[PDB]
Design a protein around this ligand. Sequence first.
Ligand SMILES: Nc1ncnc2c1ncn2[C@@H]1O[C@H](COP(=O)(O)OP(=O)(O)O)[C@@H](O)[C@H]1O
Ligand SMILES: [Cl-]
Ligand SMILES: [Cl-]
Ligand SMILES: [Cl-]
Ligand SMILES: [Mg+2]
Ligand SMILES: [Mg+2]
Length: 592
Amino acid sequence: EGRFQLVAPYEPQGDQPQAIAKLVDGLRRGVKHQTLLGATGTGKTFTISNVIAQVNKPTLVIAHNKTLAGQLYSELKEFFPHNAVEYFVSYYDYYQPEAYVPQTDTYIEKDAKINDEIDKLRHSATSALFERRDVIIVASVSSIYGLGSPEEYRELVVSLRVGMEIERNALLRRLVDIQYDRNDIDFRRGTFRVRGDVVEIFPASRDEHSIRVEFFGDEIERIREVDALTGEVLGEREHVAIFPASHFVCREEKMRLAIQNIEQELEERLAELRAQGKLLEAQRLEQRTRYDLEMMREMGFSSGIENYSRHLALRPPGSTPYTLLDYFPDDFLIIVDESHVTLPQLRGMYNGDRARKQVLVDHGFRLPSALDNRPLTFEEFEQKINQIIYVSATPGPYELEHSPGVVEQIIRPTGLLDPTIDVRPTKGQIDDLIGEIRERVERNERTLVTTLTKKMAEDLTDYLKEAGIKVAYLHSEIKTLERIEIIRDLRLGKYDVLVGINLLREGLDIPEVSLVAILDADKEGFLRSERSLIQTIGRAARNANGHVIMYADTITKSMEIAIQETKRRRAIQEEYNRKHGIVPRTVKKEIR
DNA sequence: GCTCTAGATTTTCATACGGC
DNA sequence: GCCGTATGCCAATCTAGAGC
Ligand SMILES: Nc1ncnc2c1ncn2[C@@H]1O[C@H](COP(=O)(O)OP(=O)(O)O)[C@@H](O)[C@H]1O
Ligand SMILES: [Cl-]
Ligand SMILES: [Cl-]
Ligand SMILES: [Cl-]
Ligand SMILES: [Mg+2]
Ligand SMILES: [Mg+2]
C-alpha cells in the first residue's frame, strides 16, 4: 500500500489539463487501450505523471532505448521523490548469443559480461514491487524476456523482524540458499558476513547501504541500516526483507527429475535425427548435451544453462515464460513511450530469438526445448496487459486501431509554435543551405541537417568545414558517451551545425536549434516516411524562429502529410496564443 | 514476388583457463 | 573440485524503399 506524491514547480498548462482528465476518465471507465498523441515539447511525461498520481497504480513504462529510458527515469525521480521510481533493462555491458549461420557454416560461441549497477537496479525493481505499491519501473523490452516465477521469488525472501526467534547459522544457510555469498574481506552487495553477535547483509538491491542485524542468542535484538562507505548507522528498523540475489533459483530437490527428462529428450531427438540421416547433427547434440549434463551432475550450474529453462522449471512444453509483467499486481498500468517504435521493437524481439534458436535446433546445436526459453510473443504481451496508454507524437497503426480515439495534446505550456516549412529545389541546394546556415550563425542559432547515408553525412560535413562553418557529424558509429559531448558542444556553440541521418529525432531537446534541413526529402523510404518527417520537424519546435527546409523536386505522399499535420499544429497553437495573448519565448534550458 | 539495401535500437540465467 | 582473472567488437530483429 502507498500513494504517489507528485512534486513539480508548475501546474498543468495548455492542452495538458484536458489530456490528463480524458486519460484518467478512460482508465476509471475501464478502457484497456488509450493513446496520448503529444506533440514534441508539450510535456508528455508530466501529463503522464499526473495520470499516474490520480489513479494510483504501480506502473511500468516501456521505452525503446536506454538513453530515453535513462531520461524518463531521471525525470520521474524528480516528479516522485517520495516513491519507488526504479530501472529495468538488459544488464549486459556486451552480449553475443549462441548462433549458427548456415550461409557461412559458422558457429558463434556465447560471450557476455555483466554490469553490476544494472543488476542491482533490476533487483531493486523486482523487490520494490513486493514491498510497496507506489512504484514506477522505467524499462526496456528486457521486461518481456524471461524471469523465474515471482511466486517462487517471493516465497524465498528471508523476513527479519525485531523479536523474531531464529538461529544465526540457519539464517546464514538461508542467505546462501538464495544466492548470497559469504565474504568477510570484501563486503559488497550480494553478500553477508559475521562480526560477533551481528550479521551484516548487503541486499542484492543496494549499493551504499548494508543491513546490520544484532542478535541476542536466537533473538534479533535490533536491526539497523548502515552506510557501506563510512560505517555509521542510518535508521532503526523494526523489520526488513532480504530478497534473493538472483531471479532464477534452481533447487536440488527437483533438479534430479529435470535431468532424467532432459536425457529422455536427448535420446528421442538423437534417434529422430539419425532416422533422417542427419548424423553430424546428432553427433553435435550428443557431444554438447552430454557435456552440459555432466556439469549439472558434478556442479549445479552448466554453461548456457538457460537453454534447459523449461525442463529445470518442470513445466510443460510450449509454456509461456514468467516475466516482469507477472511481477506486477493484476491491476497495474503500462505506459509505452514512443509507441510507434517501441511496439515494433517489442514485436520483433521474439522473432529474432526464435529464428536464431530454430536453426541451432535444426543443426543439432540445441534441443527443441531450447525454443521454450524465450521472450513473450506480442500476442502474449497483449493478454498480460491490464490497461495501457501509448504515448507518441506520431502514433502507429496498432495504437490507433485499438484506441477509442486519441487524446491530443498539441499546445505547449511555453507557448511555442511548430516551425514553418519551406520546400526548395535540389538545384544549388547545398549553397542555399550554406547561406541559410550563415544567417543562423550570425543570430547565435544552430542548424540540424539530415542526409540518407553515413558517408553522405561525412562528405557533407567535410564540405561544410570547407566553407568555414563549424560542424560535426552524428551517426551510429559514434559511441553513446561521445554523442552526449557532441550535442553538449553544439548547445554550447563549439559547433554551429550538426549533420545526422536518423539520430536527430525522437527525444532530442535542443532549443538552440532554429533550423532543420531535410535533404532528399522526396527520396521515399523509412528515413522519409510520414512519421520520420514529422519527428525530424519537431527538432525546430523548441525555438521562436523555428524553421524547416525540405530540399526536394517533388512533394511525396509523406511530405504532403507532414506539411499538413505541422501546419495544423501551428494554427491551433497560434490561435491559443492569440486568445491568451502569449509571445512565444525560446526554451530556457541549462546546458551542463 | 524475390532479394537486397539503408541506419538504428533492443534482447539474451558468462565462462575458459590456469594455479592452487 | 575450487578458486580468481582475462576476455568480446562475432546474430536477427525493425520499417520501407531499390533493383531484377
Ligand atoms: N505544466 C507545465 N508548466 C510549465 N512547464 C512545463 C509544464 N509541463 C511541462 N513543462 C516543461 O516543459 C519542458 C519540455 O517538455 P518535454 O517533456 O520536452 O516535452 P516532451 O518530452 O513531451 O516532448 C519540460 O522540461 C517541462 O519541465
Ligand atoms: Cl506466465
Ligand atoms: Cl549531399
Ligand atoms: Cl557536397
Ligand atoms: Mg486539442
Ligand atoms: Mg520526452
